[PDB]
Symmetry: C6
Subunit: 60 residues, 6 copies
């Protein structure tokens, strides 16, 4: 797995990220936690994002 260490490093280091969705929407914040299917992204509030709707995860 490449996915878990990649997200874990962003989460551990509190790196601001952009999460692009498959419909072109750009979400921004910090990754707080994740599991096999979802990622918890926090900006002003915490939202649960389904990985199936995610296209790309990038440091912002």
């Amino acid at each position: 797995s490449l996915q878990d260490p990649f997200l874990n490093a962003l989460r551990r280091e509190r790196v601001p990220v952009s999460i692009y969705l498959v419909n072109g929407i750009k979400l921004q914040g910090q990754i707080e936690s994740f599991d096999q299917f979802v990622i918890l992204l926090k900006n002003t509030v915490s939202q649960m994002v389904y990985k199936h709707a995610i296209s790309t995860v990038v440091p912002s």
Copy 2:
């Protein structure tokens, strides 16, 4: 440990308003009544079954 289950279980038990964004950009609003592996039942004026595969994100309103 699932993160999805505690997140949706907290929203369900809290009975708070929730915003569900669909992959096509539509935003649904209501209370989470229950959920299983594939669907969430959202309650507003009516009770509706939402397939998780169609959801991009879930946030308390």
Copy 3:
């Protein structure tokens, strides 16, 4: 499918007019004749097979 199946079976056994929204935003209407793991058979003018993978939400109309 501890939720999915009882939700759909009730709509089917009770012959409730339903709305089925697809992930592209199209809204189909009719009665659920039957369903299995993968598809719903919706009847209005004719019987049509809807793949669950293309469905966003099912609600009584």
Copy 4:
């Protein structure tokens, strides 16, 4: 299960169908054959349609 007898009834009676794709595109023709993952649709040509791309199959 429902797919096989639904698709086979259409095949056996050679009834023209509309296959609507998840993106709204409408295909037309007759069901020639199908398997777990694809449907062969016969019109002016024989085209292989991936079920994962289909929203609905309707007698046309």
Copy 5:
């Protein structure tokens, strides 16, 4: 339980039949089936490209 997809694509590859592959977003690719596996098709055009089946709606000979 017998595949229709595999002999279909295989025959296309075998005889170098010109195809159109339509994507789920409406984009039309053109060329020849070069190879394929469980998850991808390699389509030979003016260049060689790997196409994910999950992104494919239809494969059309013409």
Copy 6:
């Protein structure tokens, strides 16, 4: 049998690639690594791209 050798050849030889996404967006850069579900694309930065969001991968 086709995907792994294809992506590894690009990675190993450091060939500049275009990754087209299901929403039409085109990403460019070098394949850093990949696993079963993701490809790490290196550009100015490292982005994790979900394969479910990819339609095509081609040398640019």
